[PDB]
Enzyme design. Structure first.
Site, PDB file in Angstrom:
ATOM      1  N   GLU A 355       0.258   4.622   1.754  1.00  0.00           N
ATOM      2  CA  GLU A 355      -0.420   5.650   0.980  1.00  0.00           C
ATOM      3  C   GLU A 355      -0.824   6.828   1.841  1.00  0.00           C
ATOM      4  OE1 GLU A 355      -1.283   5.973  -2.571  1.00  0.00           O
ATOM      5  OE2 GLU A 355       0.647   5.021  -2.164  1.00  0.00           O
ATOM      6  N   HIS A 485      10.509   0.688 -18.245  1.00  0.00           N
ATOM      7  CA  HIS A 485      11.058   2.016 -18.016  1.00  0.00           C
ATOM      8  C   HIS A 485      11.984   2.472 -19.132  1.00  0.00           C
ATOM      9  CE1 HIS A 485       9.692   2.013 -13.732  1.00  0.00           C
ATOM     10  NE2 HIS A 485       9.747   0.712 -13.949  1.00  0.00           N
TER      11      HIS A 485
END
Ligand SMILES: *[C@@H]1O[C@H](CO)[C@@H](O[C@@H]2O[C@H](CO)[C@@H](O)[C@H](O)[C@H]2NC(C)=O)[C@H](O)[C@H]1NC(C)=O
Ligand SMILES: *[C@@H]1O[C@H](CO)[C@@H](O[C@@H]2O[C@H](CO)[C@@H](O)[C@H](O)[C@H]2NC(C)=O)[C@H](O)[C@H]1NC(C)=O
Ligand SMILES: *[C@@H]1O[C@H](CO)[C@@H](O[C@@H]2O[C@H](CO)[C@@H](O)[C@H](O)[C@H]2NC(C)=O)[C@H](O)[C@H]1NC(C)=O
Ligand SMILES: *[C@@H]1O[C@H](CO)[C@@H](O[C@@H]2O[C@H](CO)[C@@H](O)[C@H](O)[C@H]2NC(C)=O)[C@H](O)[C@H]1NC(C)=O
Ligand SMILES: *[C@@H]1O[C@H](CO)[C@@H](O[C@@H]2O[C@H](CO)[C@@H](O)[C@H](O)[C@H]2NC(C)=O)[C@H](O)[C@H]1NC(C)=O
Ligand SMILES: *[C@@H]1O[C@H](CO)[C@@H](O)[C@H](O)[C@H]1NC(C)=O
Lengths: 595, 98
Positions: A355, A485
C-alpha cells in the site's frame, strides 16, 4: 483554434482540483467514522462533483479534436470529451441503471437454503465462501457449487441478455463496433511516431503470450491432479479434466486454497516471521517506519509528514464503525493518506509495503495536469505495488532488517515450497482470466448467439482451462454472471496484463541492482541505480503512451512472457521430474457423470 | 472548509512590467468573440481563489512573503544600518574615531 483550448483547460484545472478535494475529503470522513449524517454528507458533496463534470463535458465539444497539434493538450481533451452514457434515449438510460442495480443486489443478497433444513440459509460471503475454501467433503462442495448457480445465476440470465443489447447500443453510438472494443480502448495509442497500438492488437498479444505459458500450466495441472486423487479417490480421472467444485473457491479463479493438499515437503515449515515481531514489541508504527526505510533505501522520497497525523493506521481506540479495508487515498492538493487496520503479522507487514507503493506512485506524477494523474494504463497501478511486496518477502531482506537468525539456512526444499505457493496464485489464475475475457469479447461482437452461451462456455473450460462441470447446464443458467466482475460491470483483462508487467518490472530492476542468483531471491534494497530506473516511469502519469513508459524500465515496447517464465524455472525443472510416470494434458471427453 | 478570501489573477493580456500593479476586474476575452461583460465560453472572470485548508500537503499551504527592495535615487542620504560604539579609554595614546 488551439490556443482557446489551452485557456479552457486551465480554468478546468483549478476548479476541478478543489471540487475533487472536498468530494474526496467527505468520502474519507464517512469511511473512517460511519454515521448516516456522514452518508448524507458525502452524497450531496459527491453529486456536486459529478454534476460539475457533465457541465464541462458538454462544453468540451465546442472545440474540435483533430485541429490540435500538441499531444498533451489533445490527451486531456479526449478524456474529457468522452460521452460514455447519455448517448442513449433517456428512457433507455434509466432502464440500464435499473438492470445494473438489480444484478448488483441479487449477487449481494442472494441466499441458498439447505434441503435438510429449509430454515437455515447462507449468503455467499459468510458461509458459502467458507465451505468452498475449507471443506474436504465431496458431497458438500458439490451442493454449494450447484445451488449457487441454480438459485442465483438463473435470476441473472434474463437480466444479462438485456444488458448486452443496451451496452452495445451505447458503444456503437460512440463509434466502436461493440462493447468489447470499448473496453480495449484503454490500451489504444494514436500517432506518437513508432509507439502506436491498435485496439485489435491487444487480442493477438494476449493469445501470443498465452501459448508460451501452456507448457508451464500443463505440468502444474498434472501435478495438482495427481495430488487430488489422494484427497478424493474414486472421483478423479488420471487423464481427464479437474471437476469444477474441487478447486479451492467458488469459481476456480485462484488455486491458492489447494496448498495443504499439494505441498511438496510438508515436514518443512514455510518461513513465517510473526512470532519474531511480537517478541521485539513492534508497535503499529514500526511496520510503516521499516517500510519507509525500504523506499528511502532505493532513492525515493520520504513520506510527506502530513502522512503521519492524518492517516488512521489502526482501527481506533473507540469502538468506531469504520470500513476496515487496506487502501491508499490521493485526496488531492498533495495530501496522501493510507487507511488500514493493521495487526502485527507478516501478512500486514507485506501489504504495508504494497500500500505504500501506491503512495510513492501517486507522489511521483503529482506535477502533471489533473486529467493525467492516473497510471499509464489500468494495469500499471497494481503492478508497481506488488514488486514492492515481492522484494520484502525474501529471506535475504528479512535477515538484514532484523527478523531472522543470522544463522538461518535456506535449503532447496523450502524454495520449492515457496515457489509452488506462488504458482497456485499467479499461474493458476492466468487461464481463468484469459478464457473469461475471450468469452465476453465474443458475446459482445456476436460470434456466440444467445442459444449457445452456456454451450460455448463449458467447451472453453475443458479446452483452455482443463476444468469439467459436474452437472450439465442448459441455456437457463448463466454461470459467468455468478462472478462479481461480470454482474457488477467490470473489465477483467487488467488482471492478465498486470501479471505480465509485474515480472517485466522485477527482472529489469534486478539487472540494475546487479543480482547474481535466481530471480526469485532478488532484493532492490540499498541500490540507487534501480530506483532511478523506476522513477523515470513513475513520474509520467498518462502524459506519454504506455508503450513509451515500458521502454524506460524494461527496454521493450510490448508485454513479454519470458520474464514470468524465468521466475518459475526452478519449479518447472522440478515439476518435469515429478511427472515422469504421469500423463501431461487432459481429455475433453471425460465427465464425472458420463458413466 | 476552505479560506476563499485569498485570490490571484490567472488571465491577463500581457505580462506585467516590473513592480506594476493591476487590480482591475474586467471579464477576460480569450477567443475572438467579444464578451460584453457577461461570462461564457472564451469569456472568463479573471480571478481565482486559493481554497486553503488545514489538511493540505506542504506546497499547498499558505506562505507569507515580504520583498524588501532597497533603492538609491539621487538624494543626500537616508536610512541605514545601526552602529557599534566602543568604549572610552582615557589616559593612553589611542587611535580614536568620534
Ligand atoms: C463522526 O464525525 C462527526 C463529524 O465529524 C461527529 O459528529 C459531531 O461532530 C461535531 C464537530 O463538528 C461535534 O461538535 C459533535 O459533538 C459530534 N456529534 C456527536 C454526537 O458527538 C461524530 O462525533 C463522529 N463520530 C464519533 C463516534 O465520534
Ligand atoms: C505544448 O508542447 C510544448 C512542447 O512540445 C510544451 O512546452 C514546454 O512547456 C513547459 C511549461 O509549459 C516548459 O517548461 C518547457 O520548456 C516547454 N518545452 C519546450 C521544448 O519549449 C507545452 O507545455 C505544451 N503545452 C501544454 C499546455 O502543456
Ligand atoms: C456525443 O454525443 C453527441 C450526441 O448527443 C454526438 O453528436 C453531437 O451533438 C452535439 C449537439 O448535441 C453537437 O454539438 C456535436 O457536434 C455532435 N458531435 C460532434 C462533435 O460531431 C457527438 O458526436 C458525441 N461525441 C463523441 C465523443 O463522439
Ligand atoms: C537439494 O539438494 C540436494 C543436494 O544435491 C539434492 O540431493 C541430491 O539428489 C540427487 C537426485 O535425487 C542425487 O543423485 C544426489 O545424490 C543427492 N545428493 C546427495 C548429497 O545425496 C536434492 O535432490 C535437492 N532437492 C531438490 C528438491 O532439488
Ligand atoms: C543495506 O541497508 C541497511 C540499512 O542501512 C544496512 O544495514 C546496516 O548494516 C550495518 C552493518 O551490516 C550495521 O552496522 C547498521 O546498524 C545497519 N543499519 C541499520 C539501519 O540497521 C546494510 O548494511 C546495507 N547493505 C549493504 C550491503 O550495504
Ligand atoms: C527522510 O527522513 C529521515 C528522518 O525521518 C531523514 O534522516 C532523511 O534525511 C530524510 N530523507 C531525505 C532525503 O532528506
Amino acid at each position: 483554434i488551439e490556443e482557446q483550448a489551452k485557456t479552457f483547460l486551465d480554468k478546468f484545472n483549478h476548479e476541478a482540483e478543489d471540487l475533487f478535494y472536498q468530494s474526496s475529503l467527505a468520502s474519507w470522513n464517512y469511511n473512517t467514522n460511519i454515521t448516516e449524517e456522514n452518508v448524507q454528507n458525502m452524497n450531496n458533496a459527491g453529486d456536486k462533483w459529478s454534476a460539475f463534470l457533465k457541465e464541462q463535458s458538454t462544453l468540451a465539444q465546442m472545440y474540435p479534436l483533430q485541429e490540435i497539434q500538441n499531444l498533451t493538450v489533445k490527451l486531456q481533451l479526449q478524456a474529457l470529451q468522452q460521452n460514455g452514457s447519455s448517448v442513449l434515449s433517456e428512457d433507455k438510460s434509466k432502464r440500464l441503471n435499473t438492470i445494473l442495480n438489480t444484478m448488483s443486489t441479487i449477487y449481494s443478497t442472494g441466499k441458498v437454503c439447505n434441503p435438510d433444513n429449509p430454515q437455515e440459509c447462507l449468503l455467499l460471503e459468510p458461509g458459502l465462501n467458507e465451505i468452498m475454501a475449507n471443506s474436504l467433503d465431496y458431497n458438500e462442495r458439490l451442493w454449494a457449487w450447484e445451488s449457487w448457480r441454480s438459485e442465483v445465476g438463473k435470476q441473472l440470465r434474463p437480466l444479462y441478455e438485456e444488458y448486452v443489447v443496451l451496452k452495445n447500443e451505447m458503444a456503437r453510438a460512440n463509434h466502436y463496433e461493440d462493447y468489447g472494443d470499448y473496453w480495449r480502448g484503454d490500451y489504444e495509442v494514436n500517432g506518437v511516431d513508432g509507439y502506436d497500438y491498435s485496439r485489435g492488437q491487444l487480442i493477438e498479444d494476449v493469445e501470443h503470450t498465452f501459448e508460451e505459458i501452456k507448457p508451464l500450466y500443463e505440468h502444474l495441472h498434472a501435478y495438482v491432479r495427481a495430488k487430488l486423487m489422494n484427497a478424493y479417490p474414486s472421483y478423479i480421472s488420471p487423464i481427464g479434466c479437474l471437476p469444477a467444485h474441487l478447486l479451492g473457491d467458488m469459481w476456480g479463479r485462484f488455486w491458492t486454497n489447494l496448498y495443504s493438499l499439494t505441498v511438496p515437503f510438508g515436514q518443512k515449515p514455510n518461513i513465517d516471521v510473526t512470532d519474531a515481531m511480537v517478541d521485539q514489541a513492534w508497535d503499529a508504527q514500526r511496520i510503516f517506519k521499516e517500510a519507509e526505510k525500504f523506499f528511502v533505501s532505493v532513492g525515493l522520497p520520504n513520506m510527506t509528514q502530513g502522512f503521519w497525523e492524518n492517516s488512521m493506521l489502526t482501527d481506533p481506540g473507540n469502538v468506531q464503525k469504520a470500513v476496515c479495508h487496506p487502501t491508499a487515498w490521493d485526496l488531492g492538493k498533495g495530501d496522501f493518506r493510507i487507511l488500514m487496520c493493521t495487526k502485527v503479522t507478516m501478512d500486514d507487514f507485506l501489504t504495508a509495503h504494497h500500500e505504500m507503493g501506491h503512495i510513492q506512485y501517486d507522489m511521483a506524477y503529482a506535477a502533471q495536469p489533473f486529467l493525467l494523474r492516473n497510471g499509464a494504463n489500468e494495469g500499471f497501478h497494481e503492478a508497481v505495488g506488488e514488486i514492492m511486496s515481492l522484494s520484502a518477502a525474501t529471506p535475504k531482506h528479512l535477515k538484514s532488517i532484523g527478523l531472522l537468525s543470522p544463522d538461518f539456512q535456506e535449503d532447496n526444499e523450502t524454495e520449492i515450497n515457496f515457489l509452488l505457493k506462488q504458482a497456485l496464485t499467479i499461474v493458476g489464475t492466468l487461464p481463468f482470466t484469459y478464457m473469461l475475457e475471450k468469452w465476453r469479447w465474443m458475446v459482445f461482437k456476436g460470434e456466440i448467439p444467445k442459444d449457445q452461451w452456456m454451450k460455448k462456455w463449458w467447451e472453453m473450460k475443458r479446452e483452455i482451462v482443463g476444468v469439467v462441470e459436474p452437472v450439465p447446464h442448459d441455456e437457463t443458467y448463466c454461470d459467468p454472471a455468478s462472478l462479481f466482475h461480470v454482474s457488477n460491470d467490470y473489465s477483467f483483462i487488467r488482471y492478465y496484463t498486470r501479471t505480465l508487467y509485474q515480472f517485466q518490472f522485477q527482472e529489469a530492476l534486478c539487472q540494475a541492482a546487479k543480482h547474481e542468483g535466481p530471480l526469485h531471491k532478488c532484493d532492490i534494497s540499498n541500490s540507487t541505480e534501480a530506483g532511478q530506473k523506476l522513477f523515470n516511469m513513475l513520474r509520467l502519469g498518462k502524459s506519454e503512451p504506455w508503450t513509451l513508459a515500458l521502454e524506460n524500465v524494461v527496454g521493450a515496447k510490448n508485454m513479454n512472457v519470458r520474464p514470468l517464465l524465468n521466475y518459475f524455472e526452478p519449479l518447472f525443472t522440478w515439476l518435469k521430474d515429478q511427472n515422469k510416470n504421469s500423463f501431461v494434458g487432459w481429455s475433453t471427453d471425460w465427465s464425472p457423470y458420463a458413466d | 472548509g476552505g479560506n476563499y478570501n485569498y485570490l490571484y489573477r490567472l488571465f491577463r493580456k500581457s505580462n506585467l512590467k516590473p513592480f506594476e500593479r493591476d487590480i482591475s476586474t474586467e471579464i477576460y476575452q480569450a477567443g475572438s468573440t467579444p464578451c460584453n461583460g457577461v461570462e461564457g465560453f472564451n469569456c472568463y472572470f479573471p480571478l481565482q481563489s486559493y481554497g486553503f485548508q488545514p489538511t493540505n500537503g506542504v506546497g499547498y499551504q499558505p506562505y507569507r512573503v515580504v520583498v524588501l527592495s532597497f533603492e538609491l535615487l539621487h538624494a543626500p542620504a537616508t536610512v541605514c544600518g545601526p552602529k557599534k560604539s566602543t568604549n572610552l579609554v582615557k589616559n593612553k595614546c589611542v587611535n580614536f574615531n568620534f
